[PDB]
């Protein structure tokens, strides 16, 4: 069963801005998603400090980057704390309505789209490069769910039928036709070293074929 939800109006406006504004520095999406994964890995690590059983669903703490040129997807996988169904629905664990306000305003002061993460809504920068985003997630206290949106004002949530991931989150970017440079090994490597060099978890870039 698939449930369909309307985005809050501020978030719809944020996504419409990101999708349609001329902005060439689109590579920042990858910094924001890796940074979110790092935050989520810090969270399960912190929680395991007092309850080691929270790592029963997987002790490895890492980030995988999986390009697939045939499907034209770039997938970011982490083994962080994951998100519950209620988290997913409430703007993927973000305070997105106020963060959008503080952002879509701060733009009016002296601000650039690349500062989106300072306002807690860096995830939505995925729509600089993706026409659709699927978020598959598993939190210790809930089942595995898939969130999906092609923007246009709505998103869906469903129980996920794919492979069990134990614990963590998978962001599948269905790339725009003219954004396939982010499937290229050298380009992903360049972005990671430029923006993510001091992330404290191993980042594995998968190769293809």
Strand partners, 134: 148, 172
Residue closer to ligand TUH by CB (options 22, 123) is 123
Which three-class secondary structure state does DSSP give residue 84? Answer: coil
CB of 14 to ligand TUH, least distance (A): 13
Which three-class secondary structure state does DSSP give residue 32? Answer: helix
Nearest to 170 by CA among 102, 109, 80: 80
Asked whether residue 78 is marked as a ligand-binding residue, the answer is yes
CB of 209 to ligand TUH, least distance (A): 26
Backbone angles phi, psi at 142, to 5 degrees: -150, 175
Q: Which token pair is 206?
A: 């998968």
| Residue for token pair 């430029």 | 194
**b (16+ CB within 10 A) / e for 98-129:** ebbeebbeebeeebebbebbebbbbbbbbbbb
Q: Which token pair is 61?
A: 């703490």
Asked whether residue 97 is marked as a ligand-binding residue, the answer is yes
Residue closer to ligand TUH by CB (options 90, 179) is 90
Nearest residue (beta carbon) to ligand TUH: 40
Asked whether residue 123 is marked as a ligand-binding residue, the answer is yes
Residue closer to ligand TUH by CB (options 22, 90) is 90
Which three-class secondary structure state does DSSP give residue 79? Answer: coil
Binding site for ligand TUH (CB under 6 A): 33, 36-37, 39-40, 43, 78, 80-83, 92-94, 120, 123, 135, 169, 171
Residue closer to ligand TUH by CB (options 61, 183) is 61
CB of 20 to ligand TUH, least distance (A): 21
Residue closer to ligand TUH by CB (options 72, 139) is 139
Asked whether residue 160 is marked as a ligand-binding residue, the answer is no
Which three-class secondary structure state does DSSP give residue 100? Answer: helix
On whether the CB atoms of residues 175 and 74 are closer than 8 A, the answer is yes
CB of 207 to ligand TUH, least distance (A): 22
CB of 74 to ligand TUH, least distance (A): 12
Residue stretches of the annotated binding site: 36, 78, 97, 123
Residue stretches of the annotated binding site for ATP: 36, 78, 97, 123
């Amino acid at each position: 069963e698939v449930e369909t939800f309307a985005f809050q109006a501020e978030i719809a406006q944020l996504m419409s801005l990101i999708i349609n504004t001329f902005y060439s520095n689109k590579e920042i999406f990858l910094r924001e998603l890796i940074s979110n994964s790092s935050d989520a890995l810090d969270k399960i690590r912190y929680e395991s400090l007092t309850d080691p059983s929270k790592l029963d669903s997987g002790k490895e703490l890492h980030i995988n980057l999986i390009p697939n040129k045939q499907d034209r997807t770039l997938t970011i996988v982490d083994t962080g704390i994951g998100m519950t169904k209620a988290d997913l629905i409430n703007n993927l664990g973000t305070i997105a309505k106020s963060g959008t306000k503080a952002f879509m305003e701060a733009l009016q002061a002296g601000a650039d789209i690349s500062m989106i993460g300072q306002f807690g809504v860096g995830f939505y920068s995925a729509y600089l490069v993706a026409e659709k985003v699927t978020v598959i997630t598993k939190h210790n206290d809930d089942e595995q769910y898939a969130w999906e949106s092609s923007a246009g004002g709505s998103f869906t949530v469903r129980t996920d039928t794919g492979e069990p991931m134990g614990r963590g989150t998978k962001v599948i970017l269905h790339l725009k036709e003219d954004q396939t440079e982010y499937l290229e090994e050298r380009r992903i490597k360049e972005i990671v070293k430029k923006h993510s060099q001091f992330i404290g978890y191993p980042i594995t870039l998968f190769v293809e074929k």
